[PDB]
Structure formats: C-alpha cells, structure tokens
Amino acid sequence: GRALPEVRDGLKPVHRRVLYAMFDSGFRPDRSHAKSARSVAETMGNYHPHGDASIYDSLVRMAQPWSLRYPLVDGQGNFGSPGNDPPAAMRYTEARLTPLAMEMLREIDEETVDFIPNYDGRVQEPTVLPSRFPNLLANGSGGIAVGMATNIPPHNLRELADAVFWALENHDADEEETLAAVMGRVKGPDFPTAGLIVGSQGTADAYKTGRGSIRMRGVVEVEEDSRGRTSLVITELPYQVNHDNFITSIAEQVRDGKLAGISNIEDQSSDRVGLRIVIEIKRDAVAKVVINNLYKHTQLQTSFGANMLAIVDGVPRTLRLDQLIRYYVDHQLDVIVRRTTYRLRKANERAHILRGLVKALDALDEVIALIRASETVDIARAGLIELLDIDEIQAQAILDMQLRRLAALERQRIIDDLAKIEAEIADLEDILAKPERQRGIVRDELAEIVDRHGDDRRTRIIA
Amino acid sequence: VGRALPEVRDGLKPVHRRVLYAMFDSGFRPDRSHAKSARSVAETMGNYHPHGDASIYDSLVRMAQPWSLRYPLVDGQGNFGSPGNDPPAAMRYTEARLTPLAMEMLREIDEETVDFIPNYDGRVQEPTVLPSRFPNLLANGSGGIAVGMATNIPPHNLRELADAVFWALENHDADEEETLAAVMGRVKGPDFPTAGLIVGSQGTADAYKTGRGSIRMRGVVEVEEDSRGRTSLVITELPYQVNHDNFITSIAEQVRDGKLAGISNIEDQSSDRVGLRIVIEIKRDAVAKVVINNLYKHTQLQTSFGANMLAIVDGVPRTLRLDQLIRYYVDHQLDVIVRRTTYRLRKANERAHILRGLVKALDALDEVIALIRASETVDIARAGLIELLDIDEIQAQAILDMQLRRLAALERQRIIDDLAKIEAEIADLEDILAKPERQRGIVRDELAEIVDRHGDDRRTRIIA
Hints:
The PDB classes it as isomerase. Two copies of one chain form a homodimer. Chain A is an alpha+beta fold. Chain A is built from 16 helices and 17 strands. In chain A, helix 6 packs antiparallel against helix 7, helix 6 crosses helix 11 and helix 11 packs across helix 16. The radius of gyration of chain A is 29 Å and the shape is elongated. The interface between A and B is large, with 45 and 46 residues.
C-alpha cells in the first residue's frame, strides 16, 4: 500500500498526494517555480499530516533525472546527485510540475477519477490520477535494493505507446496474442541511466511471468596515454548504482587484493562530460581482463531482479506485460467515458441557462419593463417565470445578467454560445454511444503526448 | 534577537505572530469547529516560516496552555501536554482555533491598520505587528523566570491593565512621573495564570519603576493533621513556570541528599477533579511549619520572578518602566484607530463615487438602456455612457456591471438611499479624523467592551 504502486497510475499515496497538492496549488510548468516548502506544506496540511521526511523526499526523488526515466517534478536548486551529495533543504529549493506530470493530472477536475475524503474529512483527494501516459511502466516502481517489495523497471515511452495502441486497436485479442504483440513492441527496460542489458532471457521471463533477472552493465571506453599507458573509462553505470559508492568500491576491492590490474583511479566527471571515471591499468595488464574483473567485483555489472508486483482493484498481483498494458488501457477508457459524461452533464446545464437567456433576448423590451415595474426582486423573478415560461434557475440567470451583456455583440455571443453548446452536446452523446470513438480518443490524445514528450531509447540491449 | 524579545506594541515574536495570522487568514475562528493543528502548522510553514523544525507547533501548543498564558490565544482540543513533563500529542491528533481574545489581537487587520511586508519568498504579505486591541504584552507577559532568559515581563490582570490604559487615554499629556504613579496605582502586580502568592511589594515596585525587580513568588501549602498526630503538607498551587514534575523530583532529590530531613513520603494526588495536589507526609518528630520553611529555602515552592522588562521599541531593544509599556501600547491603539478611520474614509469615498454614477444612470435609465443596446460593443457602450452622463471610466464600468435585478423598484431606491447613507458615514469619519479626543474615546470604549466581555478575577494573591 505504501509499499506497492497502483497499477493504473503507477503511484503510491505519498507521491500521488504531492503531485495533486502541486497541481491544486497551480505549480504548473508555465509558471515560475515555487519554493519547495510550499508544496511540502500543502501536502502536509491537506493529505499527509506528519512532519516526517517522506513528503520532501518524494518531491526530490520525482525531480531527479537519474531516478525517474520521465521526471514528474521540475526542480530548481540542489536536488542532490547520482552520488552521495545531499539535496538542499526545502526552503532552499524550488519546484513545479513537469509537462508529463500535467498529463498525469489532466482533466482530474472533470470527475475522471474517484475522490474520497482526506484525513480530517475537510477536503477530497484523488484515489488515482488520470495518468494520460502509462506511468507505472514508464517510470517503474520499487528498486534493486534489498527489501523493496516490488521492482518494476522503467521503459521507453514511445515503445509503451506502440504496445498501448496495439492493445487499443486489437480489443478482441486474447492474452496469448496480446502478450506476444506487446513483447514485440516493448524491447526491454529503458533506464534513465542508459547502460546495457545483456541477454534476452531475464526480460522475457519478467514479461511472461512477472519475475526475471535482467543483467545490466555500464559502459567502458578504452583510452591510450602517450607514455603508452592505457586506461579504462567508465561513462555509464547500471540503474540505481550510486556513483560515489561505486568509485569507493573499486579502491576497496584493489586493497582487498582483487583487481590486481589497476594502477590508478581518478574521477574526472563533470557537468560537461558527464560521468567519467578513469582507471589506469598496469602495463602488464590486459584491458579486456580488467573489465571482466570489474564486472565480477563491482556494480559495473549488476542484476535487476524484476518483480512486477502492483495493486489491482485493491489486491496485490504479480502481473505479466499484457496485463500491465491492458489494465492501463481499461483505465484510459474509464477516464474518457467519465470525462465525456461530466462534459455532457455540464453542457446540458449550460444550454438550459442559455435557452432562458435567449428567450429573454427575444422578449427584451418586455423583460426589462417587467423588471423595472416590479417592486421587488422576488416579484420580478416570479414575473419572468410567467412571462417566458422558464424555471427558477433560468429566471435567476436573467436577473443576474449584467447590463454589459445587452450590447449587440454580447447579445449575439449568447445566441452563438447556445448553437455551439448544442453542437457540443450532440458530439458528446455520440462519443458515449460509440466505443470506437472512445478508443480513438485514447489513441489520438496519447499519440499527441508521445509526439511532444517521447524520446530515444537510452539502454542498449545485447542478446 | 527578534526571536528572543517581544515587540512592545503587540507583545509577540515572529513565530507566534505568524501562527496567529495564519490561523486567522485560514478562518480558524472561535465560532467555527476546531481545525486539526496540522493545518495551522502547514499554513504557517508554507507561507511564513519554511523550516521543518517543531518551532511552529511548539508555538501553537504553548499559546493554548492555560498554565502558560494568562489569556490564552489558542483554543486547543486534545492533549496539549501539562504543567509537568507529559509530551503533547502530535499535530495530526490535536485540534486548534483562535480564542475570542486572539480575535481582538487581529481585529480589523484587513483595514490597513498595521504595516504589512512581503513574506520570505515575496509571494504574499504578512503583518509586521497585530492591531492588539487589548494590551497583550502586559497581559500575557514574555520570556520567563529561568536563569539566562533574554527577557521576563510578567502577565497581569486584564481589568487592572485596562484601568491603567483608560487613565493614560484620559491624561494623554501627563509626564512620565505622573503617568508612572497613576499606572502603578492601578496595576497591583503580576497576575499569574498559575495563581499562587506574591510576598511583599518592593520587587514589584522596582520592576515597574526601573524595568528590573526581584518578585518573590510562593505556592500555596495547607497542613492536614489528624488526632493520631499524622501530619501532611498539601501543595495546591505553585509559582509561575514551576514545572510540577521537576518540582516533585527536586524534593525527592533534596531528601535523598540530606536537606528536608523532616519528610517521610511524597505522593502526587493531582487529578482533573481536584487540580494540583502534592501530598508530603512529615515525620512524627518534625514540625510542619519548619518543614514548610525548608521547602521554601530549598525548592521552588518559593522562587523569585526576576523581572526584566526588555522589549523591542521601533526595532531597538529597550528596558522599560511600566508607564512606558502602557504609553507605547496606547500610542499603537491611537495609530490603529487613525489608520482604520483613514481606510474607511477612502473606501467610503470610492463607494460614494460609484453610487453617484449609478444615480445618474437611474435618473436617465431609459436612455442608458437604449444606448447600451444600440452599442455594437461594450467598449462603445462605455464611451457612450461617459458622454451621456458626464461620468468617468470607473463609474461607466460600474453601470455596465449592474445586474438586471438592481432595476426592480426597491433596488433602484436602495442605490439612492445608499448614497445618502454613505455621505453621512463620510461626514462622521471626517469628524473622527479632525478630533484627537474622539479617537481616544473610541479606543476607550472599544477596550471597555473587550474587558467587559473577557476580563476576569485576579488569581495571584499579593500578601505582606
């Protein structure tokens, strides 16, 4: 629960609450970053009333591009590093949502997801987010650390979308056919940290059964010195491997007598060259041999023990890739049907009011004279109901019209708005009647998201 | 330093001021249900004091404790700790709203009665001081009796303070000597929330005359004895800020270490029903009054309130006499009233200006409606109204913003009546600004209403 992500939006409660607090506060991509204290405070006051570290820790982690394949928070200031640099405190950093987090929250105010009372019953909070891209698979959940209850790897948005589009179009396909199609499209995890996946079996096992051992490796380049001395240069590391602990481990293995080929270690990493750990080897040593000993004795090679465990309708389940994709598609179709239902109800309310306003415009001299002749507002309201054959809510809307609405252009705007809303109502009715339009909406809206925010695969796969 | 010394005008330090302002702005008022304390903590932290330390909740809790503040400013529900060592419950498990007296600290803060400044990130404004419509620094005091506290201003009885303030309002031009005599005549001494006794008059007078004095406090002890000669001392009140648990521990320690030779047992029989009741059994061969005297010498059953009346005045820390504390308070009230009246006058004039435009429109209403309907756009109607009625942009906009409901007969006459009413209100506000003694009378009457409703009896008895 606090341990396991919801299958539909890939979130656990503290992360969902932070993102909803930010959204409700207006901390969007198109406005200046807000002090992080503000997002922490809003979350603490309304959703998570504890002064524990988890709120700000969640905000920070969601801002780190080495941590999330698709960051949900856009941080400004010191949010730490892939090594042991601590993040600054919340009064020294700033944060707002990223554009993709805006897609997690899109149209959440249109009754697209169930809300329930918060801890003190004073406000509602969402049980799940609309999640207009497949966040669980895109950003993953848990980790390689011992004690993680789940370990779902991140994936490439464009590949996931191909699988989602396939499952949408092929809505009659059985589980076997769906699993083969989505496994053809999702090549394997795609970590924010790039690196390599070596072998095919662990990935297949993970997708077919919900568990598999996926061998990851970093990347080593070989450089020559003038004095004839060759060095190995590590430029990428496996997902969740701490850069400082890795550097430290090499030193320590060297002392403990492993890694006898190594004469020197220097961290040359920087903002411009990225990760660049330079390992000089002895003139007697073979580069290729030293690299293999690094795989053995350090996290330059480490296994990702995939465990695709998520909550589905309140129950933890270990899921195959076809199930992760299909439950996500079911959620998107639910969000679309709910959004269209909401829009239709609001359009009908608006049309009802505009019909009354248009009746008033058609009888404007009489309406104005009736209101001026009425001794009180209640007498005018009653008089309007009789004159125009309208109900209380329509009459109140006439009485609430401002004199500015009577300028010719504004009268026409009311007429035009009624025609427009009746066309909108017709369209929304049609979407509700046609599952093919509903599937088409998920497809088109996700395609636009992927066209704008999709990116290249970073992790290379070696069978 | 701003953290250690109260402002002289409202008696607050920044964290307490920010908590109260956050609670007020959140609508956590006395006339609405208590809100979880977490909400007041969060609103303060996000907008005014962005540190994760417990200073905010500590502030909120201390203001809710009736043994800590003579006139509590927070109304707590749940476990806010005790006069001993019991920890308060966490902020998700307690609830809090402002008390009626705190509402008087914040009264009319939205009427430009105090300077506001941008908060820590520049997104919102926060008050530099609160209106403080009762003399909170003197009523609740500041600092404390422990060695090394930066200041120690005692709490006082609200009714006695109001008598002193009233004298100062009436005698606005009295010099310091006369003012000091008059206020020391009316403010008898500290009045602690924890009651107890003050012994003698010298220390109180010293404190008021010079800003420093040693005021001897005592708890209340009763001797209970029976016919077998069994005797016990029963302590039912302690001096201000004497922690009940640390006091009990200190007796056990003084006994273990060879003072208080007359004591055989100590038992805490305090309860919600009887209040504080610490029972000290004395040995058969001991004399009760002798043991009481040794408890005064060797424990905080008697202890000094080392008054040190240090507060910030116009940004400078100053050690103040009682006449200065009163006069700086009065000057702040006169400032609040002049500022409030200036604000009300500007707003009334703005409203009269709009009403004059609306009355012009009503006089020419056929023409106005015809003109608007014949106008292609709102911009064209607005220009046409300016020309038609000889008004300005803001008046023309108010006409365009009128709802059709305002055109019913009683509503047309309401607008015209409101202009006459607002003009009378303007004359009255002008008269207040022109008459300093009217302004003093307003502070007097408003404070009297507050003291009438919220004042209470003296708790600390002053003895020879």
